[PDB]
Amino acid sequence: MKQYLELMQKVLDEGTQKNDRTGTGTLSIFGHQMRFNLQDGFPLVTTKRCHLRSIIHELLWFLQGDTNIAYLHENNVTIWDEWADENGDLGPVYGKQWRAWPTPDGRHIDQITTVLNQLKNDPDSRRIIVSAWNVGELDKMALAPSHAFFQFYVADGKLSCQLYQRSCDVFLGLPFNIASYALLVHMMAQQCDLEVGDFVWTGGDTHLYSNHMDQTHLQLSREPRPLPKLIIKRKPESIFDYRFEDFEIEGYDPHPGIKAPVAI
Amino acid sequence: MKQYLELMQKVLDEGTQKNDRTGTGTLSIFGHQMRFNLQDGFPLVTTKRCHLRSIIHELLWFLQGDTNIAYLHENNVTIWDEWADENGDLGPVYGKQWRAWPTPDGRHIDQITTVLNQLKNDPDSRRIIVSAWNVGELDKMALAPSHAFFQFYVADGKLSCQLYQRSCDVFLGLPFNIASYALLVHMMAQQCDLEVGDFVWTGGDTHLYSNHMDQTHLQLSREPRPLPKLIIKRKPESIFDYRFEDFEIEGYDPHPGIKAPVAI
Ligand SMILES: Nc1nc2c(c(=O)[nH]1)N1CN(c3ccc(C(=O)N[C@@H](CCC(=O)O)C(=O)O)cc3)C[C@H]1CN2
Ligand SMILES: Nc1nc2c(c(=O)[nH]1)N1CN(c3ccc(C(=O)N[C@@H](CCC(=O)O)C(=O)O)cc3)C[C@H]1CN2
Ligand SMILES: Cc1cn([C@H]2C[C@H](O)[C@H](COP(=O)(O)O)O2)c(=O)[nH]c1=O
Ligand SMILES: Cc1cn([C@H]2C[C@H](O)[C@H](COP(=O)(O)O)O2)c(=O)[nH]c1=O
């Protein structure tokens, strides 16, 4: 996609060399923003083939509050295997914080149900927020949350969302992250009877791994194709009742996929 | 400042009318970003006179972990009076979360001391984050945190910071918020022996209150003046040991101040 290739180029031209947690080395910029008008099409990268199966199942997994990789294996998704312990556990990452954030006084807060209540009763609210950054549980998580903090906004009958992503693997992670949140905006809007508006992506440390350089040059030589359309076939009774079958991505005709190593 | 007046104009030209919590009514956009290179000067608005006394004391107050307004009154600062209860308490807002975030299992996490440790031992870390958005305590806070989430970044010997502000009163709040965080970046960099880099401001619901319209037009008629310089006179032994006296703002020569009502 145009916005995506522009970011890749900017990281190449303006990025500084930086060591990192994984010992791989990166080219990094700090602070970037881009916007996708979801009415123009579903923002799924076309300059390389993206595995939709993994994207959709990861989101449905977050929404059930699961942090164990069994559900992903049941469905042949292996994107979280490198960080799981011997029992398949990741600790209280994304899904746990979204569905059951533990309080000091012994309760669990379901942020997703709260957001639903806000959007149906107080759509003008400026506090429609989900956070995965639970400071008290960071030390139990296999990875600190990357897509950490997100806000909904309603104007003129349209639902928008902004994600703050503190750390962004531009090649491997970002195409999944944009599609994942775009899907959520479509699900939320369907459940609340709203039209879709904008997805606004904001990044902190936004980087290319040094062993993604050839794959990056290859992809930048290719021309984006038209964006596909997302069709949701059914209105489930709740946001927690979607199924893989319910989604159709029509007119997705990407360039071939490019393999690259994940930095562990 | 140029970036600031450009935002004001954009909200006037592109903002949509929106009701709000306070019943005042706003013009609102969603999602905006701007960047201040702190080496070019201290980003204190010059098209209206800003009360530096209130800005500096509010920051020193956050840093001591205080959520009671007594310290502010001691120092003739009254910017938080409308939301305090009969004993001067705001609940566990900003300062409490920064200095003593309560965990489910009974501990308190001092995020500021953690950040200091990270910047001195793991400056390349992509997890150098402070959050005020403690989901488990939101219902005890007089106001949900506006400047909610911030990240530090080190590159090439320079310290940068990005703030996510979910809700931004463009006229009254933003000039204080930009100066407040810029000050913190200068304090942090001094304590860590780094040069200052960029302050990156990101906003969610970014708005003009409807009863700030005349004051907004007045300010947009004025030409920005040169940015002042910030001098820190002393290196205290720690980030918690700064005093009002320690800061000099040299060459600040603003246009007159513009009064406007605060929406409660
Ligand atoms: N350095 C780094 N670590 C990470 C992630 C990341 O993006 N970067 N993550 C984002 N998430 C993943 C995990 C794997 C793939 C991945 O390998 N995708 C490949 C293979 C696709 C497939 O196997 O189905 C690709 O698009 O070509 C895509 C997304 C999970 C999470 C795990 N930790
Ligand atoms: N709607 C709304 N509610 C708010 C804030 C806000 O910005 N907007 N807040 C940001 N913080 C304040 C509070 C008051 C002033 C203020 O009135 N400043 C005025 C008067 C200055 C002074 O009295 O010293 C000005 O710059 O002209 C400036 C910043 C605290 C917090 C309280 N709640
Ligand atoms: C889980 C996840 C990780 N990442 C990345 C960004 C970094 O490269 C990161 C983990 O390293 P970090 O915790 O040291 O930042 O993996 C994403 O880009 N998207 C994701 O969804
Ligand atoms: C405390 C604070 C509030 N505000 C604002 C933005 C909104 O106008 C807000 C409170 O309303 P909200 O919680 O309904 O968003 O006051 C700032 O802009 N900066 C600040 O530092």
Side-chain angles (χ1 to χ4, degrees):
Chain A
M1 298 181 283
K2 172 164 160 163
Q3 308 85 311
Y4 181 75
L5 298 171
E6 284 181 41
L7 177 51
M8 283 193 137
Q9 197 68 61
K10 178 175 180 217
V11 181
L12 281 185
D13 296 342
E14 288 181 35
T16 73
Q17 290 207 19
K18 230 192 145 220
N19 293 315
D20 85 292
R21 177 181 58 76
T22 77
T24 308
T26 72
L27 238 33
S28 169
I29 67 170
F30 188 63
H32 184 77
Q33 180 174 88
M34 46 195 191
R35 180 186 300 263
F36 299 87
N37 178 166
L38 295 175
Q39 268 171 25
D40 289 348
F42 187 71
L44 186 55
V45 161
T46 67
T47 52
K48 96 182 173 186
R49 182 179 276 283
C50 289
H51 200 221
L52 279 158
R53 191 183 184 78
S54 295
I55 296 168
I56 295 170
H57 283 297
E58 196 197 29
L59 183 66
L60 293 180
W61 181 67
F62 291 155
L63 283 171
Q64 297 310 120
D66 199 345
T67 61
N68 188 283
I69 59 170
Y71 169 87
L72 296 182
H73 286 358
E74 263 175 60
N75 291 110
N76 294 287
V77 180
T78 63
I79 65 160
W80 274 106
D81 293 359
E82 288 77 354
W83 302 272
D85 71 17
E86 42 189 40
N87 298 137
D89 280 315
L90 291 170
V93 296
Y94 302 102
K96 201 275 200 97
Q97 306 308 151
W98 289 16
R99 293 308 309 291
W101 172 296
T103 67
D105 62 18
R107 306 164 296 148
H108 294 94
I109 294 166
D110 182 342
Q111 296 186 76
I112 300 296
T113 287
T114 295
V115 157
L116 276 163
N117 289 151
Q118 292 174 132
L119 281 172
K120 290 176 184 279
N121 292 281
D122 199 15
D124 292 312
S125 176
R126 292 177 294 227
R127 315 169 161 178
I128 319 181
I129 291 178
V130 176
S131 183
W133 194 264
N134 188 152
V135 178
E137 298 220 297
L138 289 170
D139 53 359
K140 311 206 302 133
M141 296 180 199
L143 280 174
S146 282
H147 45 110
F149 190 98
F150 63 102
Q151 187 169 4
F152 291 102
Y153 172 90
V154 183
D156 299 322
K158 298 191 204 140
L159 184 66
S160 295
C161 174
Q162 176 166 192
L163 173 64
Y164 191 90
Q165 189 160 345
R166 67 154 180 94
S167 179
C168 178
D169 176 345
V170 166
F171 188 83
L172 275 179
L174 191 54
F176 272 46
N177 297 136
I178 295 166
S180 191
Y181 276 86
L183 229 198
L184 185 64
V185 179
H186 269 88
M187 289 155 77
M188 207 70 77
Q190 186 189 219
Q191 286 301 315
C192 293
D193 280 33
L194 296 163
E195 301 301 333
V196 297
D198 284 344
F199 175 56
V200 180
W201 182 85
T202 302
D205 187 325
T206 307
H207 51 266
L208 286 163
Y209 283 98
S210 63
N211 64 355
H212 289 174
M213 290 313 292
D214 296 342
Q215 289 92 157
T216 287
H217 288 306
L218 178 60
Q219 191 165 0
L220 283 167
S221 67
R222 297 170 168 183
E223 202 74 17
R225 291 182 174 166
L227 288 181
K229 299 299 175 176
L230 177 77
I231 309 297
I232 308 192
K233 294 185 218 164
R234 181 172 72 97
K235 195 189 181 163
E237 299 217 326
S238 93
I239 198 86
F240 309 114
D241 289 302
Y242 287 82
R243 299 192 279 246
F244 182 81
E245 61 185 87
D246 295 323
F247 303 101
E248 280 294 339
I249 292 89
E250 148 178 296
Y252 184 48
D253 178 29
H255 289 267
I258 306 162
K259 293 146 215 70
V262 71
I264 303 172
Chain B
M1 298 181 283
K2 172 164 160 163
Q3 308 85 311
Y4 181 75
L5 298 171
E6 284 181 41
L7 177 51
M8 283 193 137
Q9 197 68 61
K10 178 175 180 217
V11 181
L12 281 185
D13 296 342
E14 288 181 35
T16 73
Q17 290 207 19
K18 230 192 145 220
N19 293 315
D20 85 292
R21 177 181 58 76
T22 77
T24 308
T26 72
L27 238 33
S28 169
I29 67 170
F30 188 63
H32 184 77
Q33 180 174 88
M34 46 195 191
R35 180 186 300 263
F36 299 87
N37 178 166
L38 295 175
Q39 268 171 25
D40 289 348
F42 187 71
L44 186 55
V45 161
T46 67
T47 52
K48 96 182 173 186
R49 182 179 276 283
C50 289
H51 200 221
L52 279 158
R53 191 183 184 78
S54 295
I55 296 168
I56 295 170
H57 283 297
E58 196 197 29
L59 183 66
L60 293 180
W61 181 67
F62 291 155
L63 283 171
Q64 297 310 120
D66 199 345
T67 61
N68 188 283
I69 59 170
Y71 169 87
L72 296 182
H73 286 358
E74 263 175 60
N75 291 110
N76 294 287
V77 180
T78 63
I79 65 160
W80 274 106
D81 293 359
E82 288 77 354
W83 302 272
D85 71 17
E86 42 189 40
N87 298 137
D89 280 315
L90 291 170
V93 296
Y94 302 102
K96 201 275 200 97
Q97 306 308 151
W98 289 16
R99 293 308 309 291
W101 172 296
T103 67
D105 62 18
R107 306 164 296 148
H108 294 94
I109 294 166
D110 182 342
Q111 296 186 76
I112 300 296
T113 287
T114 295
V115 157
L116 276 163
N117 289 151
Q118 292 174 132
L119 281 172
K120 290 176 184 279
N121 292 281
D122 199 15
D124 292 312
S125 176
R126 292 177 294 227
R127 315 169 161 178
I128 319 181
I129 291 178
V130 176
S131 183
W133 194 264
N134 188 152
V135 178
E137 298 220 297
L138 289 170
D139 53 359
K140 311 206 302 133
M141 296 180 199
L143 280 174
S146 282
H147 45 110
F149 190 98
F150 63 102
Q151 187 169 4
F152 291 102
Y153 172 90
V154 183
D156 299 322
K158 298 191 204 140
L159 184 66
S160 295
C161 174
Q162 176 166 192
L163 173 64
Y164 191 90
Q165 189 160 345
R166 67 154 180 94
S167 179
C168 178
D169 176 345
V170 166
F171 188 83
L172 275 179
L174 191 54
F176 272 46
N177 297 136
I178 295 166
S180 191
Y181 276 86
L183 229 198
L184 185 64
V185 179
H186 269 88
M187 289 155 77
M188 207 70 77
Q190 186 189 219
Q191 286 301 315
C192 293
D193 280 33
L194 296 163
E195 301 301 333
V196 297
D198 284 344
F199 175 56
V200 180
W201 182 85
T202 302
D205 187 325
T206 307
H207 51 266
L208 286 163
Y209 283 98
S210 63
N211 64 355
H212 289 174
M213 290 313 292
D214 296 342
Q215 289 92 157
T216 287
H217 288 306
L218 178 60
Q219 191 165 0
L220 283 167
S221 67
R222 297 170 168 183
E223 202 74 17
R225 291 182 174 166
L227 288 181
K229 299 299 175 176
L230 177 77
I231 309 297
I232 308 192
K233 294 185 218 164
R234 181 172 72 97
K235 195 189 181 163
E237 299 217 326
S238 93
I239 198 86
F240 309 114
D241 289 302
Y242 287 82
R243 299 192 279 246
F244 182 81
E245 61 185 87
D246 295 323
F247 303 101
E248 280 294 339
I249 292 89
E250 148 178 296
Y252 184 48
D253 178 29
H255 289 267
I258 306 162
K259 293 146 215 70
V262 71
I264 303 172

